[PDB]
């Protein structure tokens, strides 16, 4: 099957974490791909399926300037949005919806018993729930339909360091998520107690994030983008949950070329695994300051110092996972996670080992 061009041009794309207006130059093609470049491309290569606007809907505003559309897309159990002569504005968001419309002309609410409110955001809630037929929990992610509109993949799905989708249902207005729910706490609070990791003891989470994140990678073909500490949970044994409790807006994680808005992929995947890396290992954040202007300063400009305790494998890893510039950061190149996967920091390893849960859980949760 081969794809052209519906529409394209330049447009003005809203910075994120710093909300100055960009210029980007857009291609949509009748794959699915919506894909913003840093300037007019040449040959116009498989893209991630982050930039499919398939189950999306747009919208027009004119805050904060009069010509502005908005597209709203469910990505698996997620709602992400991004804001972009009035003329235009009626015929991009013509396209967008033709293709996304195109691209999809191919439980109830209570078995479960609420136990108590897990967080909340600008597009739903997430909850705890008992299932009433099993007693084993679950986390409920509640998100309002009318954001948005205004099939069992979830078994294909399954790796043994991401939380699980078990059921998906919908009801009067909610969007529902049944997601499995990992006992041992997450290890935020665990380095809390402990300070700082061995070097051991961070191969062994690293490992399983690693193993997670080449999943999303080679089979969903999917980058996550919000690797963070507090986004690791232990299962009732020891081993990685990677959580997916997105509700809007989840900084010290994000890769430069994300705070910028540049063009990103697989790559702001292994900058956070540095980060959350970098911060077992250490004890602290590689950049952090409680200025915002100088957080970003610090990620995109800033060199990173080692302690003088780091042996030279464990920062041979976090130097290239730490790379500004993310084709020459380890992990960016065409084998992705094999790379990593590979570096000395991880030698004797043998990964599907890692994906059978052979490796031993440095902590064991008290449940
Ligand atoms: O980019 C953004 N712009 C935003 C703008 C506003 C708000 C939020 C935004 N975001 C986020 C969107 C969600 N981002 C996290 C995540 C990534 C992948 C899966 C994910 N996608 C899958 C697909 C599949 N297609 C077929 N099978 C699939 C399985 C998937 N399994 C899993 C997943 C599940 C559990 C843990 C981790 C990943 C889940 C969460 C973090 C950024």
Request: net charge positive; glycine share 6%; proline share 4%.
């Amino acid at each position: 099957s081969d794809v052209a061009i519906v529409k394209e041009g330049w447009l003005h794309k809203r910075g994120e974490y710093i909300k100055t207006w960009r210029p980007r130059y857009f291609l949509l093609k009748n794959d699915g791909t919506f894909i913003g470049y840093k300037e007019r491309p040449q040959d116009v290569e498989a893209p991630l399926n982050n930039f499919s606007v398939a189950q999306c809907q747009l919208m027009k505003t004119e805050r904060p300037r009069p010509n502005t559309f908005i597209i709203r897309c469910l990505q698996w159990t997620t709602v992400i949005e991004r804001t972009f002569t009035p003329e235009e504005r009626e015929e991009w968001t013509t396209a967008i919806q033709t293709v996304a419309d195109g691209l999809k002309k191919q439980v109830t609410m209570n078995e479960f018993e609420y136990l108590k409110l897990l967080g909340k955001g600008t597009f739903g809630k997430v909850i705890l729930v008992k299932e009433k037929a099993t007693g084993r929990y679950y986390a409920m992610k509640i998100l309002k339909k009318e954001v948005i509109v205004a099939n069992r993949v979830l078994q294909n799905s399954r790796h043994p360091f991401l939380t699980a989708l078990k059921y998906s249902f919908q009801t009067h207005d909610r969007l529902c998520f049944v997601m499995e729910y990992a006992n041992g706490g997450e290890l935020f609070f665990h380095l809390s107690r402990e300070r700082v990791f061995s070097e051991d003891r961070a191969r062994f989470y690293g490992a399983e994030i690693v193993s997670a994140l080449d999943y999303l990678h080679s089979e969903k073909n999917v980058v996550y983008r919000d690797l963070k500490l507090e986004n690791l949970m232990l299962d009732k044994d020891g081993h990685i949950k990677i959580t997916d409790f997105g509700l809007c807006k989840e900084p010290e994680y994000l890769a430069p070329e994300v705070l910028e808005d540049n063009d990103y992929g697989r790559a702001v995947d292994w900058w956070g695994l540095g980060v959350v890396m970098y911060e077992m290992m250490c004890g602290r954040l590689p950049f952090y300051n409680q200025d915002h202007e100088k957080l970003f300063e610090l990620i995109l400009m800033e060199e990173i110092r080692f302690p003088r305790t780091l042996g030279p494998e464990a920062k041979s890893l976090l130097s290239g996972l730490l790379k500004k510039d993310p084709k020459q950061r380890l992990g960016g190149g065409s084998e992705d996670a094999k790379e990593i996967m590979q570096h000395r920091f991880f030698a004797g390893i043998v990964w599907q080992h890692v994906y059978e849960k052979k490796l031993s859980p440095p902590f064991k949760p008290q449940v």
